[PDB]
């Protein structure tokens, strides 16, 4: 058929109960993740095609970048808690990978301050148990899908996107196929 298990997607042996409908994992340290988000705009293209009432969820991962990598997972938790994901995503990617001016937790915080988040507000969130639970949630989600690498995307806790089984050449054909596949899976 057009969409095939083992080609554009695979199926989790162990489906995840109560998972977000569309779940993406990434790292701000991850070069392919920079391409996925800042060049290919996969998240945005997926969202442009999603059915009514389907939310996209995006979690950060710890396993790249040591202490800073975890700092970034905690900052992403802050971004989710404050609802400022779409204000910090681009400057965090560029700060870690393009300018490489993000080298410490304080450099991360600077991105938020520069994006208009008040210092007291960032610090209160950073040190909150709500943010610690959000960090734990991201870590548990990675465990639940038995995550091996990023970028990754899972649909209804059952299906894993398989970009290596898609077409490579026009980045645009690739992006459209990825997005079309997510939509197919959402209705499956």
Token pair of 186 as six digits: 């959402």
d(CA 164, CA 149): 13
The separation between CA 56 and the C-alpha centre of its own chain, rounded to angstroms, equals 9
Token pair of 32 as six digits: 């392919």
- Phi and psi based region of residue 179 (left: phi greater than 0; alpha: psi -120 to 50; beta: remaining): alpha
Give the residues across from 152 on adjacent strands: 25
Q: Yes or no: say if 145 and 160 are a contact pair by the CB < 8 Å rule.
A: yes
Q: How many Cα atoms occupy the beta-carbon half-sphere of 3 within 13 Å?
A: 20
- Other beta carbons within 10 Å of 18: 6
Cβ-in-10-Å burial (0-12, 13-18, 19+) of 34 comes to buried
User: What angle do helix axes 42-49 and 171-186 make, rounded to 10 degrees?
Assistant: 50
- Other beta carbons within 10 Å of 93: 20
**Sign of torsion over alpha carbons 9, 14, 15, 19:** negative
User: How many residues in the chain?
Assistant: 188
- Resolution given for this structure, in angstroms: 1.7
Compute the C-alpha angle 167/148/93, nearest 5°: 75
Contacts of 5 (CB under 8 A, 6+ apart): 11
Token pair of 140 as six digits: 């548990």
- CATH number of the domain that 57 lies in? 3.40.30.10
Token pair of 61 as six digits: 């991962």
Q: First CA to last CA across the chain, in angstroms? A: 14
Q: SS3 for 161? A: strand
Q: Are strands 22-26 and 56-60 parallel, antiparallel or unpaired?
A: parallel
Q: SS3 for 148? A: coil
User: What angle do helix axes 66-82 and 119-126 make, rounded to 10 degrees?
Assistant: 110
Q: Which domain holds residue 11?
A: 1-188
d(CA 24, CA 6): 19
Domain count, the chain: 1
d(CA 77, CA 125): 9
Integer CA distances (angstroms), 139 to 15, 111, 142, 176, in order: 17, 23, 5, 29
Residue with tokens 């705009």: 41
Token pair of 181 as six digits: 């596949």
**Sign of torsion over alpha carbons 72, 132, 55, 116:** negative
């Amino acid at each position: 058929a057009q969409y095939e298990d083992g080609k554009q997607y695979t199926t989790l042996e162990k489906p995840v109960a109560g998972a977000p409908q569309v779940l993406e994992f990434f790292s701000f340290f991850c070069p392919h993740c920079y391409q996925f988000e800042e060049v290919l705009h996969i998240s945005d293209n997926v969202k442009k095609k999603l059915p009514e009432g389907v939310k996209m969820t995006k979690y950060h991962v710890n396993f790249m970048g040591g202490d800073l990598g975890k700092d970034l997972t905690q900052a992403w938790a802050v971004a989710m808690a404050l609802g400022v994901e779409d204000k910090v995503t681009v400057p965090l990617f560029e700060g870690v990978q393009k300018t490489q001016t993000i080298r410490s937790a304080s450099d991360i915080r600077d991105v938020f301050i520069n994006a208009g988040i008040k210092g007291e507000e960032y610090d209160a969130a950073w040190n909150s148990f709500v943010v610690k639970s959000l960090v734990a949630q991201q870590e548990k989600a990675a465990a639940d899908v038995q995550l091996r690498g990023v970028p990754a995307m899972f649909v209804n806790g059952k299906y894993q996107l398989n970009p290596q089984g898609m077409d490579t050449s026009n980045m645009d054909v690739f992006v459209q196929q990825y997005a079309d596949t997510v939509k197919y899976l959402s209705e499956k």
